[PDB]
Amino acid sequence: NPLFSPYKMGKFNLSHRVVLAPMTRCRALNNIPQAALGEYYEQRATAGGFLITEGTMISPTSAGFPHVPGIFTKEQVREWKKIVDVVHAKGAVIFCQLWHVGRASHEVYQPAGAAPISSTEKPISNRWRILMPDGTHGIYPKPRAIGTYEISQVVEDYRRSALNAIEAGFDGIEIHGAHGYLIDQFLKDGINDRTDEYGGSLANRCKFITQVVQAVVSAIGADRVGVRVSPAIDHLDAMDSNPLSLGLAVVERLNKIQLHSGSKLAYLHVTQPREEEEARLMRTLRNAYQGTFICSGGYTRELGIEAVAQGDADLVSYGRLFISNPDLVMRIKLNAPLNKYNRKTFYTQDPVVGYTDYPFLQ
Ligand SMILES: Cc1cc2nc3c(=O)[nH]c(=O)nc-3n(C[C@H](O)[C@H](O)[C@H](O)COP(=O)(O)O)c2cc1C
């Protein structure tokens, strides 16, 4: 089984290729990590296994979901440390995903009911709806288009949160630059309509992600930074006219950051729009990137084995199957049946129901 051949992810010696994909679960009440997160991540921790946390707030303006954790406060750092400890107690490697939603928010999630921030003043269309704190679905508002100074301050929020994650004991961080959120709102020419140095050309559209990644690299070292992108996923009206060139332009700047800093990133992480043409886009981005590649999106045990065996990826991250199967790594090793996941409790607040009560194998 190629999923269980060991892999050297830079400085981290992983024992298998099964990764916990980052998943927002909304149990971090009041943006503070709760003990429930500790039990949840510990249930899925394995010796030499790689975990990525739910999207974590870098700022008071970075949320678009309820009860999502942050790492911009000393209290959040203090509470994240107890979770990192129980995870490292089982020998797992864990990264904190740094998440800013951009325009994918609502006044209910913003301090003083302010408008969310974005590259543009264009809102998400009402084809998409935002989960409200009360379980209803609300309307995405008009965002505020920020100047270049405010762009540099957001880069600083990424930089400070990366240092906070290291203080909490995380082995590294993942930059969430996918799924139509803040960074992707700069990348995709379907969203980025700016006429300054952050809009227009493909080079200008990649400036924001380059500056974010360079800032966390120089802060904690390239070998502790992962980067997640999704060029071909139109989530939240996040289309690009040339998804492959967009992905290749992004990949090239990661390669240059590695050459500049003289060190390789932890990995590049790409979700795919889960047909053969979409598989070719992943392999094209894989072949272009000088380092570790993590593939994600609709993967199974068989597709994951097939990805690693054919060189399509070095690591495979699983989302929904990891919700319902805490011992997904053990089940996949034994080729044991997988349990179904409850969609209704993906984003609920209960610290147990649909979060930690999925049973292990008999
Ligand atoms: C409930 C849920 C929450 C998710 N939260 C995040 C997130 O916070 N950040 C992120 O980059 N991806 C997030 N994802 C996407 C996953 O990281 C991953 O791309 C996806 O689950 C892979 O598809 P799979 O379920 O077939 O494994 C989430 C997915 C689900 C189902």
Residue numbers in the entry: 10 to 283, 298 to 384, 396
Provide text from the study:
To test this hypothesis, we crystallized wild-type SlOPR3 without ammonium sulfate. We found a condition that produced high-quality crystals without sulfate, using sodium tartrate as an additive instead. Most of these crystals contained the enzyme in its monomeric state when crystallized at a protein concentration of 10 mg/ml. While collecting data for our previous study, we observed that in the presence of micromolar concentrations of weakly binding ligands (e.g., NADH; dissociation constant = 1.4 mM), the enzyme crystallized exclusively in its monomeric state, indicating that the monomer–dimer equilibrium is readily modulated, which also argues against a physiological role of the homodimer.
Jasmonates are phytohormones that are pivotal in mediating plant responses to various biotic and abiotic stresses and regulating plant growth. The first crystal structure of OPR3 from tomato (SlOPR3) showed that the enzyme crystallized as a self-inhibitory dimer in which the L6 loop, a critical loop involved in substrate recognition and coenzyme binding, from each protomer intrudes into the active site cavity of the other protomer.
